[PDB]
């Protein structure tokens, strides 16, 4: 939809990735101020409000902690407490039809000052006073739901821009929306460090002849020294041997 009908999508249980935004795919803009671009894919976030809609491209440069403008304070407010990032991509063909796409309108001259992250799906008659008009804007109200240029080559003042604003709240119990541990390949017959789902150690780990049970993960000895393990990805059994030492 357009910005006047902006989509509030509560989204979680996902894989936060910034590669798709710039380098995996060359979307127009990925902008934010407090959270680093590179740290999105390795921190785990509970839930995120996604503001997914289409806005005028002319006021995308209005998108800032302040920088009030047509969109920034009349179509959707972007305050300083921007705990998240905005992902916009140009949609010249997608949101501008040659024959007139009189559907992705914009809420011009909004009724009231935009509330903090207001659900500006409010699509009503622009407020002027206490006059009960007969459905016709009289002398002080325009048509707030006004149409863009709607050309395939929209000017600088009417560019078509798609927007997903991610604002993340990790205050609630985690829904674990993040990439899981970066699982490398497996090493046989080499003294290496290792972390298996919380089990931290260092040794040489090799193929085994022991047989486990479906509920069993670890393996010990007389003195509670970890001796066997199962690969988290797939069913198999690896013995662990300490790296050699001695006297010289």
């Amino acid at each position, epitope marked *: 939809a357009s910005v006047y009908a902006w989509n509030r999508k509560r989204i979680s249980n996902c894989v936060a990735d910034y590669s798709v935004l710039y380098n995996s795919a060359s979307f127009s803009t990925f902008k934010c101020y407090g959270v680093s671009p590179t740290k999105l894919n390795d921190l785990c976030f509970t839930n995120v409000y996604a503001d997914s809609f289409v806005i005028r491209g002319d006021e995308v440069r209005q998108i800032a902690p302040g920088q009030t403008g047509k969109i920034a304070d009349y179509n959707y407010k972007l305050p300083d407490d921007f705990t998240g990032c905005v992902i916009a991509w140009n949609s010249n063909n997608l949101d501008s039809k040659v024959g007139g796409n009189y*559907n992705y309108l914009y809420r011009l001259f909004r009724k009231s000052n935009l509330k903090p992250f207001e659900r500006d799906i409010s699509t*009503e008659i622009y407020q002027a006073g206490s006059t009960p008009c007969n459905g016709v804007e009289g002398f002080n109200c325009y048509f707030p739901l006004q149409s863009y240029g709607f050309q395939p080559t929209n000017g600088v003042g009417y560019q078509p821009y798609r927007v997903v604003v991610l604002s993340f709240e990790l205050l609630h119990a985690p829904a674990t929306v993040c990439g899981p541990k970066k699982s490398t390949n497996l090493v046989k017959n080499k003294c290496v460090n290792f972390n298996f789902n919380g089990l931290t150690g260092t040794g040489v780990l090799t193929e085994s002849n022991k047989k486990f049970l479906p509920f069993q993960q670890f393996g010990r000895d007389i003195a509670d020294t970890t001796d066997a393990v199962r690969d988290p990805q797939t069913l198999e059994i690896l013995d662990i041997t300490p790296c050699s030492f001695g006297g010289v």
Partner: antibody
Amino acid sequence: QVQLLESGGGLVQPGRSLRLSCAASGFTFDDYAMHWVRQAPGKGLEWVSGVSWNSGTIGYADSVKGRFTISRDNAKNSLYLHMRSLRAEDTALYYCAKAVEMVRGLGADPEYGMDVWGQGTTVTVSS
Amino acid sequence: DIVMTQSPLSLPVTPGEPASISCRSSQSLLHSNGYNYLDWYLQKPGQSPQLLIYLGSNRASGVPDRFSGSGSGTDFTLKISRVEAEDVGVYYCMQALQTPFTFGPGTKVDIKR
């Protein structure tokens, strides 16, 4: 069960703006497309507009494109279509329908094969 | 708008006999897979409208499968294999790719004696 309640129209003298509302149930709102399709009493059905999982509206009909304004209230499962200059071509039973296809109907939103239909409004043009 | 028409508009058909109806659209419906989008629907005075066949040829649910769809691009011909007073009525077809969408006249199908 399913029973899509749409209303908002009535003794409407032409040249005024309203907000037709459809409430729907039996599914998940913000992941299925609700479509306005008009059908005047004595006249055949005609597509008006739609809104999808990404609120993906598309357009309006032949001579009505632009006066209408499509907005969604995802939480309470509501769909508000703005009414401007409702005349004999602009008045009809504003049926709200759901397409059976799931996410990524292909690129386009699920908007075809909408066999399930609610009860449209009764916008009237004579006072 | 879309210049949409149906043929024949009003043919006398005796119930129990096949009946061919058409649709000519104006704006193309081809995605890059060979997709035909002009679904076939039916309208009955008193009850909810019937969706005849979705995606042109995939016989839609909720109605008897006696309708058979064919065609390509914007041309969409549905032949009712054996229409019954239950399947006789006003006929329409809907498309959902490029706005605006404008409909046909609506093929009136009734009982022929």
